[PDB]
Design a binder for this molecule. Sequence first.
Ligand SMILES: Cc1cc2nc3c(=O)[nH]c(=O)nc-3n(C[C@H](O)[C@H](O)[C@H](O)COP(=O)(O)OP(=O)(O)OC[C@H]3O[C@@H](n4cnc5c(N)ncnc54)[C@H](O)[C@@H]3O)c2cc1C
Length: 451
Amino acid sequence: PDVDVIIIGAGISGSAAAKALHDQGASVLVVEANDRIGGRTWTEQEGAPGGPIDYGGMFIGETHTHLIELGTSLGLEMTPSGKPGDDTYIVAGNVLRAPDDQLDPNLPFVPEFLSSLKALDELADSVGWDQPWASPNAAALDSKTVATWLAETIESEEVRRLHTVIVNTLLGADPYEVSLLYWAYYVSECEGIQSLMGTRDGAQWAWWFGGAAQVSWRIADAIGRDKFLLEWPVDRIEHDESGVTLFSGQRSLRARHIVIAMSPLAANQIRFEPALPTSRAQLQARAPMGRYYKVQARYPSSFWVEQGYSGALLDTEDVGVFLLDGTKPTDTLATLIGFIGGSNYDRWAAHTPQERERAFLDLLVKAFGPQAADPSYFHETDWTQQEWAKGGPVTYMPPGVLANFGAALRDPVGKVHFAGTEASFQWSGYMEGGVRAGQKAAAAIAEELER
Ligand SMILES: Cc1cc2nc3c(=O)[nH]c(=O)nc-3n(C[C@H](O)[C@H](O)[C@H](O)COP(=O)(O)OP(=O)(O)OC[C@H]3O[C@@H](n4cnc5c(N)ncnc54)[C@H](O)[C@@H]3O)c2cc1C
């Protein structure tokens, strides 16, 4: 036993678990697959534009309690995300301004849009976040797809669409490939879509003035930058009754307990001896990652805020993207950012890189003026082909798995413990989740150490 606990994966989740066990006084060792310490939390302060840049997650939610504390104690300083102005909606190619986040009640689609939204939150509430697979009608629910449900519950094609877009960007998938039960679950465990869809508050409420990968770096620096072995891809795990043996090719390590902090899909790439119980086996073998693009355009001035727009945008057909401002007071030049996922990623990944960029800039132009036509910096980062993330923004599920293996999302197997945002009780999918998941995992192993 080289160390007490070896944490596989250096995401905010693995890092949170590391700092947790370390502060508790246990010997810790974090093993990373590639050469950078963040996870789906990727930062570059050397960033070609005027300010550090995040290629991964970066928004902090107002109820993101654990993340705020962790990073704040680490010395990081937050900053407001939201921007003053009208949010924009492009429904069926038409540009609609929403003052006070509110859309003209007279528009024909708004009413059913407001109703279907509530209807969703209700469904989400009927199945919690604790025992979704056990809720009053899980089985039934995990049989339909968010697609067929929208079909069975919404008349308007636009309401149907802007619902679809929401799913696609919020998850990395399209409603036609996502369990209805799994979505109600997600909406529920992230405190409703109103919270999930906020642009000023809710989940999108603030940033780490400095970059999001910092929580993991600062933890690394504190706990001991040498306790992180980068480029140590784990490919096999002998997990028996006295401890666990990790293998990175011919290389190997051993600890009493290990916490595997990553997405279920990413973990399925690792061989287990003995085999994992069919329950978890199925879960990490049938829980895919979304498909996603993170696009960013940088300009000299925030011509959108300065023209009365928040920079927030929801487009159902031109491109199929959610748009948000990313201009922190510190940055030298303004930055607008969009997210293309699911079937939208699909359609666009089909074109050339430049074809995509213009499609994006064209959208920006028709939404905030001609000043968007010629940006100072433009970058896109495809995540569906990322070596280790292997996917979109979060994990998602097709009909038939959450209801029958969801439990495996959390339960340990011998000395192997599961961390990673997807293991959190709440906010599984967001950073908050990664932190909690990893702290929960640690708390568990710490108690296992005192016998
Ligand atoms: C474009 C994008 C934008 C996002 N925006 C937000 C946002 O605004 N707010 C928010 O809250 N969340 C956001 N997220 C989600 C957030 O990034 C995740 O919830 C969080 O980073 C998950 O953390 P994790 O530590 O569980 O996993 P990861 O960050 O995926 O880290 C797992 C680690 O495991 C390593 N690993 C994988 N396989 C192996 C192996 N075999 N051996 C060793 N190491 C391995 C990986 O290299 C990686 O570093 C976003 C995600 C994306 C993709």
